[model samples]
Target: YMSRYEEITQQLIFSPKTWLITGVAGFIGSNLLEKLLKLNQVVIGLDNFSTGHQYNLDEVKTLVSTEQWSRFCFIEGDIRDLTTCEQVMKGVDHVLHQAALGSVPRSIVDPITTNATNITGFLNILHAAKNAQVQSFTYAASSSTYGDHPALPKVEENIGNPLSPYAVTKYVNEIYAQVYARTYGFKTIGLRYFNVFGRRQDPNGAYAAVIPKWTAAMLKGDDVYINGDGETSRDFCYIDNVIQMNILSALAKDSAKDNIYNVAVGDRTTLNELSGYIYDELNLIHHIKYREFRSGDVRHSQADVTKAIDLLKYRPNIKIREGLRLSMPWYVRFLK
Candidate 1:
């Protein structure tokens, strides 16, 4: 089944298409960029570099051939600008909207800016994509939308009130996507990403994700703090799996269009266990301090990826331990 999806990617390489990837300098976006370019597809990337970095793009450039790199055109702009969105959408065959301000704690501190970028910028790119009549539109959604829902394995249809402003902004994305589909006959797919981490993910920010942060800290012998009891868990997904979901959703059948799906490995790992895994992978011995539980964070999260598997034939090939192992070498070189 996975081979069939790989076949689709191969077909794209043989017969290419032009794609517009918003936030193309960020972690997941740059990974997407590398894959598309390697497959011989023409790609247009847009990034503001507010949270993204030029080095990420440079890293991607090195991974692909000169001819493959030639097929990419990057626009250094923000999604907050509607005109920028309009300009990028021209002649785009597909739109992969990965641009947004992402971070729950950051949103908690400055909800206004988060709302402005995640919601307003999302609307800008969405409207522009719809107006441009792109064949497929896929945007990054968050597992945070499942906030406060008591379900053990998160299902798309069942959701609770958003815990933070960041969650609210992501929920608004689904609402707007549905409204657009119903009112304007413009369909789009939203991927509810569950703690996606891998190569090119930044490890230096105040809002840095756990995996990269922990990896870097252990590498540098810096003090590593675990919020709460180190038992808080998440469905930590790998970047390759996320890239697979994005491309699958973009080319999904009509029946699978205009809906949200969980993008996870349907597995959960407690923070304590995650720490152990990273420690073992890096072969480091260090004490990790436990701190008070942070607000606006879920205690546990795992996904029920049935909808994605059934509809889009999505399969997560990498599990937690393997993903951590695969990501370690990058962190070693990056931090050193």
Candidate 2:
């Protein structure tokens, strides 16, 4: 089904480009690294290991061929330091900046650290990219930027006040990216990822995401917490779709440049229904330990991917249920 896309991606692999991926040990970053390396791209990866794991990188080594693994160069560094950013930008054609602290609850607990990484660290990378004169700079943006906007399918331009410190940080990233594009004429793309989940998403943290966390809990026969009647909805994107969006954004034409695109399937999945879907996939009963709402969470969220579709020729190939099916085996194996 994705043969054409895979063919284009394969061409990139054969005529490999020099790429830099910040946070390469992270769940999303490592996934992207695996894809790029499989395409035979020369990659320079940076990670401080603050929230990422070394084992993730080790796991990738076992997954790829020797030649592919040899194409990777790992750097132990932090994005907060401009010197470290500058060091890694040498001879880099593209920068996929994914290094940042995640989780809204974690940010609410430690907004200072979150701000340093998401905002200040982001600026450091922007400056490094500007100085390095990279052809394209693409970074991970978030749907939390939609904040308090009561829209069903969120568009890039429409946004409301940020509901939490994390939202503020992510929204500021887009603002800064736009400013850099205008003030410095630096090419940039912000992918507002809507609840991206797949293999390698940690289910052990206090601030784990819904799918992996719930999957682990159910597998362990522990009670699941729904946080307010299991009614909150979201556009749960798969990691593969996000990878496509990232590469597309990097190779996009002038029309698709310097814009924020919604990287998600244009479908909504409510918490109750989502849990049931997970249960059915895992052969567990649909059950939840309901509780009061989370502090910084929005009620319902979805995306309008018309711009992404039109500009990047992107069609989200995997539906939500299919993503869950693909990701379930990973959770089951990892949790055991």
lDDT of 1 by residue, 1-336 (tens): 576479779778787999999999999999999999988999999999989999999999899999999999999999999999999999998899999989999899999989989999999999999899999999999999988999889999999989999999999999999999999999999999999989999999899999999988988888888998788889999999999988888788888898999999999899999988999988843228888898887789999999998888887899999898789888877886
Taking the tens digit of each residue's C-alpha lDDT, what string does model 2 give over 185-217? 987999999999998888888878999999999
- Which number leads on TM-score? 1
The 10-residue segment with the lowest total lDDT in model 1:
282-291
TM per candidate comes to 0.98, 0.96
Candidate that scores best on lDDT:
1
How much lDDT does candidate 1 score? 0.91
lDDT of 1 at 237: 97
